[PDB]
Amino acid sequence: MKTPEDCTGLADIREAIDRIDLDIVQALGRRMDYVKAASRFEASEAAIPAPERVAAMLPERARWAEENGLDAPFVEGLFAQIIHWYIAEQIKYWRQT
Amino acid sequence: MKTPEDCTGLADIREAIDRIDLDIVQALGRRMDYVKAASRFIPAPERVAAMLPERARWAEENGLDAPFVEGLFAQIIHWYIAEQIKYWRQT
Ligand SMILES: O=C(O)c1ccccc1O
Ligand SMILES: O=C(O)c1ccccc1O
C-alpha cells in the first residue's frame, strides 16, 4: 500500500481505498463486539441508550473530524447513524438474552 | 485496549470504542487524501457500482448487517465524490 503521493494511477489509489474501507468495516465489526460486551454492565434496559455518554460522544467525533481534515457535520452525521444502529442492536441483544 | 471479553466494566468498553471511533475517523481522513490524489488520473460510475456490493459483502463477513453498512458507504462515497469534484474545480 502506497502513500497517496506515491500512487502511480488509479490501480494504486483503489487498492489503498479498498484497504481503508475494509479496515473501517473490520473496525465497525470489532465495535459491535464491544457494544455487545457492554450489555452485561447495564443496570437495566433503560440504561442502554446512555444519554450523557452519547451526548458527549458526537461533539468529540466532530472534533476529531476537524483534526483530520474532514467536514464535522458529515462525520458527526455518520456517527449519529452508527450510534443509533448500535444502540438498537444492543437493545435487541439485551432483549433476546 | 482490552479485548471485549476482558473488559471489566464500561470504562474499558468506552475506552475501546473511543479508540476504534478515532481509528475510523483517522482512516476517513486518510481516505480523503487518496481521493484528492486520484483527481489527476470523476464520479467513475463502474467503480462506485462495483464498490458498494463489495462493502456489503465485507459487512456480512464481519457480522454486520449489509444494508446498514452499504448505506453508510453510499453516503461516504457520495460525500467524497463531491469533495473530489470540489478539489478538481478549485485546482
Ligand atoms: O454505540 C455506542 O457507542 C453507544 C453509546 C452509548 C450507549 C450505547 C451504545 O451502543
Ligand atoms: O470515494 C470513492 O470511493 C470514489 C470512487 C470513485 C470516484 C470518486 C470517489 O470519491
Curated annotation (Swiss-Prot), chain A:
Induction: Repressed by iron.
InterPro entries recorded: Chorismate_II_sf (IPR036263), Chorismate_mutase-related (IPR051331), CM_dom_sf (IPR036979), CM_II_prokaryot (IPR002701), Isochorismate_pyruvate-lyase (IPR008241)
Binding site for substrate: 14, 31, 42, 90
Pathway in which this enzyme or protein is active: Siderophore biosynthesis; salicylate biosynthesis
Any coiled-coil regions, as ranges: none
Consequence of changing residue 43 to P: Slight reduction of the affinity for isochorismate and of the catalytic efficiency for isochorismate-pyruvate lyase activity. Slight reduction of the affinity for chorismate and of the catalytic efficiency for mutase activity
Keywords: Isomerase, Lyase
Pfam families, A to Z: CM_2
Catalytic activity, as annotated: isochorismate = salicylate + pyruvate; chorismate = prephenate
pH dependence, entry free text: Optimum pH is 6.8.
Chorismate mutase domain segment(s): 4-94
EC number from the UniProt entry: 4.2.99.21, 5.4.99.5
Origin: domain of life: Bacteria
Regulation of its function: Inhibited by endo-oxabicyclic diacid resembling to the conformation of the transition state.
GO biological process: chorismate metabolic process; pyochelin biosynthetic process; salicylic acid biosynthetic process
Single GO MF annotation: isochorismate pyruvate lyase activity
PANTHER family in the cross-refs: CHORISMATE MUTASE
Subunit annotation: Dimer of dimers.
Physiological role: Involved in the incorporation of salicylate into the siderophore pyochelin. Catalyzes the elimination of the enolpyruvyl side chain from isochorismate to yield salicylate and pyruvate via a rare pericyclic hydrogen transfer mechanism from C2 to C5. PchB also catalyzes the nonphysiological Claisen rearrangement of chorismate to prephenate in which the pyruvylenol tail is transferred from a C3 ether linkage to a C1-C9 linkage.
Protein name: Isochorismate pyruvate lyase
Native organism: Pseudomonas aeruginosa (strain ATCC 15692 / DSM 22644 / CIP 104116 / JCM 14847 / LMG 12228 / 1C / PRS 101 / PAO1)
